[PDB]
């Protein structure tokens, strides 16, 4: 039965599911993002005050790995949570029509910023578009850092490179990746706050994008 199928979908992903996410984002999530920002800024200070020698090419700094793993875990949750809100909206996009689409427009509007959050801000995709990747650092931050660092590690360890700037670059990789997490977290906060606002102002139309009073017809 076709109505029953639609009803099952909608019963399992209700407005409480999406509200649950928004409440969490408003409370816990923005705090966690803040902590990650402070963790990252602190690590950046430690590195800024360091002089790097060959010793530093021989060990991967665990302070930085921790900050990066902690950000990747948040991004992971925000993505899974975002997809709950998308499912709640997407399964209530009504029958396609050339008119009575004022609510539909609200639905596509809010889905668009949640897509921008997942694709663009969280950098969740396998390959970014011709828009580029406007976020300072993506979901796969740990991977980016380790690749960047291991290339420079190899050249330094081997007879290792005698490049003075290559040594300073190893340090700049460590510095910049912490900077990128400070910047990325501020950016993610703005976006998460924006979606909190968008959702709470628009939710009624997100769930019921049409109501048609046939008082006029008998």
């Amino acid at each position: 039965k076709r109505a029953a199928l639609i009803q099952n979908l909608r019963d399992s992903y209700t407005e409480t599911s999406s509200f649950a996410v928004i409440e969490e984002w408003a409370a816990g999530t923005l705090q966690e993002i803040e902590g990650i920002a402070k963790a990252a800024a602190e690590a950046h200070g430690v590195i800024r005050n360091s002089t790097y020698g060959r010793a530093q090419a021989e060990k991967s700094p665990e302070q930085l790995l921790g900050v990066l793993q902690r950000y990747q875990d948040l991004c992971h949750n925000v993505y899974c949570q975002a997809e709950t809100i998308r499912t709640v909206i997407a399964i209530r996009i009504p029958e396609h029509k050339e008119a009575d689409n004022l609510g539909v427009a609200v639905q596509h509007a809010v889905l668009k910023i949640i897509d921008e959050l997942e694709i663009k801000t969280l950098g969740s995709g396998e390959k970014s578009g011709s828009g580029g990747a406007p976020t300072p650092i993506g979901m796969y931050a740990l991977r980016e850092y380790l690749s960047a660092r291991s290339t420079v590690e190899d050249k330094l360890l081997g007879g290792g490179s005698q490049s003075p700037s290559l040594l300073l670059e190893l340090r700049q990789i460590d510095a910049d990746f912490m900077l990128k997490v400070e910047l990325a977290t501020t950016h993610l906060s703005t976006m998460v706050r924006a979606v909190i606002n968008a959702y709470l102002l628009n939710w009624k139309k997100l769930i019921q994008p049409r109501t048609g009073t046939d008082h006029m017809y008998s």
């Binding site: 029509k97 050339e98 008119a99 009575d100 048609g212 009073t213 006029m216």
Partner: peptide, 21 residues
């Protein structure tokens, strides 16, 4: 289908009347 009292939408609606409402 939205801007003129004399235009029906493809579903037989007069949105300008519904907006007056």
């Amino acid at each position: 289908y939205d801007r003129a009292i004399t235009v029906f939408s493809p579903d037989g609606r007069l949105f300008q009347v519904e907006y007056a409402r």
